[PDB]
Design a protein around this motif. Structure first.
Motif, mmCIF file in Angstrom:
data_model
loop_
_atom_site.group_PDB
_atom_site.id
_atom_site.type_symbol
_atom_site.label_atom_id
_atom_site.label_comp_id
_atom_site.label_asym_id
_atom_site.label_seq_id
_atom_site.Cartn_x
_atom_site.Cartn_y
_atom_site.Cartn_z
ATOM 1 N N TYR A 125 12.725 -0.807 -2.520
ATOM 2 C CA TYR A 125 11.381 -1.341 -2.386
ATOM 3 C C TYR A 125 11.342 -2.822 -2.743
ATOM 4 C CZ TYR A 125 6.449 -2.067 -2.318
ATOM 5 O OH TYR A 125 5.203 -2.543 -2.006
ATOM 6 N N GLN A 319 6.138 -1.612 6.104
ATOM 7 C CA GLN A 319 4.835 -0.944 6.188
ATOM 8 C C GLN A 319 4.251 -0.643 4.836
ATOM 9 O OE1 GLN A 319 3.807 2.376 5.485
ATOM 10 N NE2 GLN A 319 5.805 3.035 4.739
ATOM 11 N N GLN A 320 5.073 -0.258 3.844
ATOM 12 C CA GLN A 320 4.519 0.108 2.549
ATOM 13 C C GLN A 320 4.100 -1.157 1.811
ATOM 14 O OE1 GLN A 320 7.038 2.141 -0.264
ATOM 15 N NE2 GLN A 320 5.261 2.782 -1.506
ATOM 16 N N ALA A 324 0.304 -1.716 0.529
ATOM 17 C CA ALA A 324 -0.002 -1.995 -0.869
ATOM 18 C C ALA A 324 -0.862 -3.239 -1.013
ATOM 19 C CB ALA A 324 1.252 -2.140 -1.667
#
Ligand SMILES: O=C(O)c1ccc(/C=N/N=C2c3ccccc3-c3ccccc32)cc1
Length: 327
Positions: A125, A319-320, A324
């Motif tokens: 991440y 995308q995350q 967020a």
């Protein structure tokens, strides 16, 4: 060749925006800023943590090594033009010492985390997050008509505690003007795009996207730097051994470039090596199909085929990170 995006930015803006040689530097007070400790250096400058003695706040003092007036003006004007943009280092003041006239640039301070210790600890991440933040800076400078031309880990400052990223060192940056032939002696070797290595001089913002792809490959494959050539000819050889020579030949023919016979000889003939061949036990948790798809769209010989920074930001790999932010 011309940029596919932002090609007319300096065409439409007033000459004062891009005519950096016309800049008149308004020098500040050298005594406002005191060196505390050296923190870095490179070929063109030394960097110090400093203190602003007026407000007793921290700053960064970048003391420039001897450089032509034209080049200093270029860096200053670019910094002024970009000041306030997302993740761009903020120039606060410009001063020089009376006796020697050595100039220093005064920047905001940030608590930098050394990339050589940071990168081994980044999670999947984290890589997505920081690359997205770096893309914000690149799409911004490109949208302002500027190519950075020296993207590399040393020029990306990250305060990992605050998850704050800044793109620094605009000393090699230039204004983009359609059709202009630029100097190819830019970027760090490991981050030079094929255009620099084959003397294609009418390059554009897309150069930065090759450099970004090299950083990204280094992060997901845990290989720093990813393409490790010993000199500029060897750098092209290293790239060709991965991307293959068929694609190189297509690229050279399209732009009507002949390689120096010597360089042609060193490159030889090579099949493309699929990106998955770089996966191993140490990097496996970072290497996903979205990562490979994204990477493959950056590391292209043909600069015109690479993702723009804005396109890169919308790739589903991120995308995350977007979701967020969108909340
Ligand atoms: O060239 C510039 O634009 C430029 C702008 C800002 C900075 C800030 N640098 N800060 C630090 C730094 C730089 C290189 C290596 C290590 C460090 C470091 C470590 C702790 C805290 C701040 C920094 C540089 C250049």
């Amino acid at each position: 060749s011309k940029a596919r995006v932002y090609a007319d930015v300096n065409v439409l803006r007033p000459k004062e925006y891009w005519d950096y040689e016309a800049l008149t530097v308004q020098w500040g007070e050298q005594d406002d800023y005191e060196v505390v400790r050296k923190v870095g250096r490179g070929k063109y400058s030394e960097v110090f943590e400093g203190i602003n003695v007026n407000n007793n706040e921290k700053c960064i003092i970048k003391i420039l090594k001897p450089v032509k007036k034209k080049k200093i003006k270029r860096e200053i004007k670019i910094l002024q033009n970009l000041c306030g943009g997302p993740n761009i280092v903020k120039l606060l003041d410009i001063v020089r010492d009376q006796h020697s006239k050595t100039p220093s640039l005064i920047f905001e301070y940030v608590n930098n985390t050394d990339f050589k210790v940071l990168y081994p600890t980044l999670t999947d991440y984290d890589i997505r997050y920081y690359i997205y933040e770096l893309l914000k800076a690149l799409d911004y400078c490109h949208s302002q008509g500027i190519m950075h031309r020296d993207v590399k880990p040393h020029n990306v400052m990250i305060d990992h505690e605050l998850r704050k990223l800044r793109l620094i060192d605009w000393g090699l940056a230039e204004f983009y003007h359609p059709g202009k032939e630029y100097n190819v002696r830019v970027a760090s070797r490991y981050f030079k795009g094929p255009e620099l290595l084959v003397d294609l001089q009418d390059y554009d913002y897309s150069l930065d996207m090759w450099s970004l792809g090299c950083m990204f490959a280094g992060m997901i494959f845990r290989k720093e730097p990813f393409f490790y050539g010993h000199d500029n000819h060897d750098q092209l050889v290293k790239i060709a051994k991965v991307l293959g020579t068929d694609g190189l030949n297509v690229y050279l023919n399209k732009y009507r470039i002949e390689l120096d016979p010597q360089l042609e000889a060193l490159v030889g003939r090579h099949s493309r090596k699929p990106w998955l061949k770089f996966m191993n036990a140490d990097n496996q948790h970072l290497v996903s199909p979205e990562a490979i798809d994204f990477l493959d769209k950056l590391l292209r010989y043909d600069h015109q085929e690479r993702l723009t920074a804005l396109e890169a930001m919308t790739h589903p790999y991120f995308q995350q990170v977007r979701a967020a932010e969108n909340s």
